[PDB]
């Protein structure tokens, strides 16, 4: 059943810089000790990415419907596993098909159906004081799901649901593409230790899955999990708190990149050849250093 959450404090949207993030492996071919130039859908270097928050001090629970454009770079910085998955579709109601990818704290569920999605979709963790356990309690993302063609449930796992505090510990990066009926997902998980921002560095995303879903995708929305306990009194629309997490959304465009493969086959650096004339000179010289 759908619940429209209240008691959210209104803030202007925040923005930050994606420095050299979002590079993924363009094919499945091993290369080593080579500078390889390729043209694909890449997040441009030093691009203006949108910053979203889930915090309770102010109170933020940011799950807006965002455009998909030609592809999405998604990066989330978490410590308590708040970002659980995403919604992909066009109208996000029962008229059209939509793609659901979600972690329900035990499995990863991938479904392509005509979901009647909630206006404010979320998952729920409830905290018990008597035996100190955090349990998955709510799943309020859709009200119906009919006439549907792709279903996938992963192997079971165990995931910590405790709403910890301190610094962000996990950085999870994603690249989503929807080309020729295939939903292509690239991913990379790195351990981090920082306070507020997207980290600066380089990590090449590896291919994860190609989903043959065959649907039209123009918009997308992030699924988050909230927390309920005795510290949050009220009804279902007000008696909740948000664990500390943040996520970042960038958009891909056709770009020529000069990828550096090290001696072990790992992509360790890149040049966005359309960023500036210096990077264009690097691209035409096939070198990261210019005399």
């Amino acid at each position: 059943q759908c619940v429209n959450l209240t008691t959210r404090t209104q803030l202007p949207p925040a923005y930050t810089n994606s420095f050299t993030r979002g590079v993924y492996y363009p094919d499945k071919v091993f290369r080593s000790s080579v500078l390889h130039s390729t043209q694909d859908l890449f997040l441009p270097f030093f691009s203006n990415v949108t910053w979203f928050h889930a915090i309770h001090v102010t109170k933020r629970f940011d799950n807006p419907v965002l455009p998909f454009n030609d592809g999405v770079y998604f990066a989330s910085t978490e410590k308590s596993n708040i970002i659980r998955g995403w919604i992909f579709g066009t109208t996000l109601d029962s008229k059209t098909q939509s793609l659901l990818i979600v972690n329900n704290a035990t499995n990863v569920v991938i479904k392509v159906c005509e979901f009647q999605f909630c206006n404010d979709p979320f998952l729920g963790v409830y905290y018990h004081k008597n035996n100190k356990s955090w349990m998955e309690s709510e799943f309020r993302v859709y009200s119906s799901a009919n006439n549907c063609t792709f279903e996938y449930v992963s192997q079971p796992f165990l995931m910590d649901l405790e709403g910890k505090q301190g610094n962000f510990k996990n950085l999870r990066e994603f690249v989503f593409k929807n080309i020729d009926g295939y939903f292509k997902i690239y991913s990379k998980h790195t351990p981090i230790n920082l306070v507020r921002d997207l980290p600066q560095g380089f990590s090449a995303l590896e291919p994860l899955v190609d989903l043959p879903i065959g649907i039209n995708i123009t918009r997308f929305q992030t699924l988050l999990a909230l927390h309920r306990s005795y510290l949050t009194p009220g009804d279902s629309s007000s008696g909740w708190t948000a664990g500390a997490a943040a996520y970042y959304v960038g958009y891909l465009q056709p770009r020529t990149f000069l990828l550096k493969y090290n001696e072990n086959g790992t992509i360790t650096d890149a040049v966005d050849c359309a960023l500036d004339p210096l990077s264009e000179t690097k691209c035409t010289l096939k070198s990261f250093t210019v005399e």
Binding site: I101, N103, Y152, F157, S187, L208
Partner: peptide, 13 residues
């Protein structure tokens, strides 16, 4: 099953 991360279980049928 203790995964390295929950995101690696997306490709684990």
């Amino acid at each position: 099953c203790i995964p390295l991360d929950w995101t690696c279980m997306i490709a684990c049928a």
